[PDB]
Ligand binder design. Structure first.
Ligand SMILES: O=C(O)COc1cccc(CNC(=O)Nc2nnc(-c3ccco3)o2)c1
Length: 288
């Protein structure tokens, strides 16, 4: 094929919610603009299932109004087209998603002043949503990752407190269990899994955006700091591509970042590999 896997960035915020879909090719550093979202959105989550890109929740924060989204839309790289899917039970801004067994899990997020602890599961082959057990904590700006077929919800804001706690969901049981809490309080952090560990990068602690990064190891059941990113940021996009973590854009209290940093787990170092076509925060990112 002309290209390998690409890192897709959908939506985001800059002065207002965006409809951009762009793709970065790690092999030659080129960016490509694709079909716009049907509705602008930011604070959404992105994931892939069966070669299809999904844009979940978020909100359309515009000059003349704000509308939280319960929408799920699907993008097909093969034809460069967006398709509306069944919507979720409720709008979820600052949502988290994870994929397990080809099913998409929508986690927490908010609707107005409602901070969800609820969680629902989407089955693409049926285009239908079903709620599952709710998290033990209400979490918006929660980070979500999957490890050993278990869904992890990390940090966030419960409506009052910003959290350093994290919990794990066992689909086979439909039970949530708290795990060791992180070193740092983080809402709107970038959370992903890489080489059998969960990473939590950046975020906001209630006083400033963060550049520190920590890693959870399941057999020691502990969170350990790794090399920090060069640029502090919350509401960043994050994904994994061939053994490395990519963080995209974000917000640091002063700027909408276009910076994209890459983490090398073998040397424990971060490098700025490229820049988005324009700075922005709250993007949905995935690789396919
Ligand atoms: O809805 C989202 O996903 C993000 O919402 C955010 C995030 C960070 C800051 C804000 C506040 N909005 C904001 O600062 N807008 C703004 N700032 N500067 C401009 C601007 C500059 C020139 C023209 O407009 O617009 C909203």
């Amino acid at each position: 094929p002309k290209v390998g896997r690409l890192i897709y960035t959908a939506g985001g915020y800059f002065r207002q919610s965006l409809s951009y879909l762009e793709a970065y090719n790690p092999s030659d550093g080129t960016w490509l603009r694709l079909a716009d979202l049907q509705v602008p959105r930011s604070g959404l989550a992105g994931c892939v299932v069966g070669g299809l890109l999904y844009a979940v929740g978020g909100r359309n924060n515009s000059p003349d109004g704000n509308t939280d989204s319960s929408a799920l839309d699907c993008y097909n790289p093969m034809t460069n087209q967006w398709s509306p899917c069944a919507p979720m039970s409720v709008p979820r801004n600052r949502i988290g998603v994870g994929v397990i067994d080809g099913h998409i899990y929508a986690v927490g997020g908010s609707h107005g002043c409602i901070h969800h602890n609820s969680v629902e599961r989407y089955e693409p082959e049926r285009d239908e949503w079903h709620l599952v057990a709710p998290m033990l904590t209400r979490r918006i700006g929660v980070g979500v990752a999957v490890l050993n077929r278990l869904l992890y919800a990390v940090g966030g804001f419960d409506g009052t407190n910003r959290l350093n706690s994290a919990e794990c969901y066992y689909p086979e049981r439909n039970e949530w269990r708290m795990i060791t809490a992180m070193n740092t309080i983080r809402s709107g952090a970038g959370v992903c899994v890489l080489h059998n560990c969960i990473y939590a990068a950046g975020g906001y602690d209630g006083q400033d955006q963060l550049n520190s990064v920590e890693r959870y190891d399941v057999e020691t059941e502990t969170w350990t700091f790794v090399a920090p990113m060069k640029h502090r940021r919350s509401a960043l996009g994050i994904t994994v591509h061939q053994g490395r973590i990519y963080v995209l854009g974000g917000y640091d209290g002063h700027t909408f970042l276009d910076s994209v940093e890459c983490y090398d787990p073998d040397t424990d170092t971060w490098s700025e590999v490229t820049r988005m076509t324009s700075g922005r925060s709250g993007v949905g990112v995935a690789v396919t």
